[PDB]
């Protein structure tokens, strides 16, 4: 599923991401835009053999089991395919564990490079929130 900007904003808010660990809703929408272009089916291979899955491009190295990242962890206790569903529950719940890990949203390379220190509020402008 490819979400609309305000559609994803509303879903993320409903799932309790707005101001989660102090990160406003705009930060999460911005991260999703640059990680996956709002596409739940997005996948990208990393150099180390791991893969990033879903709207927030969650890594099989630590967070999910994709059956092909030998020696990795499954800290969110899910198959990586759950992260590709049209329902974003699994992605949001795993993202909450990631952002709590100690580095905050810096865990997302795209957020650090493209969202951090910018007017992230613009990502929710015009939406019926
Ligand atoms: O959900 N369309 O902005
Ligand atoms: O949720 N406004 O960044
Ligand atoms: O991602 N464990 O193969
Ligand atoms: O739960 N909204 O994908």
């Amino acid at each position: 599923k490819v979400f609309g900007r305000c559609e994803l904003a509303a879903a993320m808010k409903r799932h309790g991401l707005d101001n989660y660990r102090g990160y406003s809703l705009g930060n999460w929408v911005c991260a999703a835009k640059f990680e996956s272009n709002f596409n739940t089916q997005a996948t990208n291979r990393n150099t180390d053999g791991s893969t990033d899955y879903g709207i927030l491009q969650i890594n099989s190295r630590w967070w999910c089991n994709d059956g092909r990242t030998p020696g990795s962890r499954n800290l969110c206790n899910i198959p990586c395919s759950a992260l590709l569903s049209s329902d974003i529950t699994a992605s949001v719940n795993c993202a909450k564990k990631i952002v709590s890990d100690g580095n905050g949203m810096n865990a997302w390379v795209a957020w650090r490079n493209r969202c951090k220190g910018t007017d992230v509020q613009a990502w929710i402008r015009g939406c019926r929130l």
Side-chain angles (χ1 to χ4, degrees):
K1 184 185 172 184
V2 186
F3 275 82
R5 178 178 63 92
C6 296
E7 187 186 17
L8 183 67
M12 286 184 161
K13 192 183 183 176
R14 183 170 57 84
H15 278 99
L17 279 185
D18 183 26
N19 271 290
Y20 195 86
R21 282 295 189 109
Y23 295 92
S24 68
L25 190 58
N27 284 282
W28 300 103
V29 176
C30 185
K33 169 69 182 180
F34 295 127
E35 291 286 356
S36 71
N37 207 13
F38 304 140
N39 179 12
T40 71
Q41 297 193 81
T43 63
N44 286 289
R45 199 82 192 254
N46 305 123
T47 58
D48 71 341
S50 69
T51 307
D52 296 338
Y53 298 86
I55 46 149
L56 289 168
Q57 289 288 283
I58 292 167
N59 207 152
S60 68
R61 220 282 142 206
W62 304 102
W63 313 104
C64 63
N65 192 341
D66 68 2
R68 71 156 191 199
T69 315
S72 65
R73 299 280 281 277
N74 184 6
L75 291 163
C76 292
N77 300 308
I78 46 165
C80 299
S81 58
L83 296 169
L84 305 167
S85 171
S86 61
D87 169 38
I88 62 161
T89 307
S91 279
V92 167
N93 291 340
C94 191
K96 287 172 172 182
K97 188 181 273 81
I98 296 162
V99 73
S100 302
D101 205 42
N103 285 318
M105 284 196 77
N106 297 297
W108 288 273
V109 165
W111 178 84
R112 179 170 50 88
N113 291 337
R114 310 181 78 171
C115 301
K116 184 180 188 179
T118 72
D119 186 22
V120 292
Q121 197 281 138
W123 291 100
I124 58 155
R125 207 161 291 160
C127 308
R128 246 104 69 171
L129 284 160

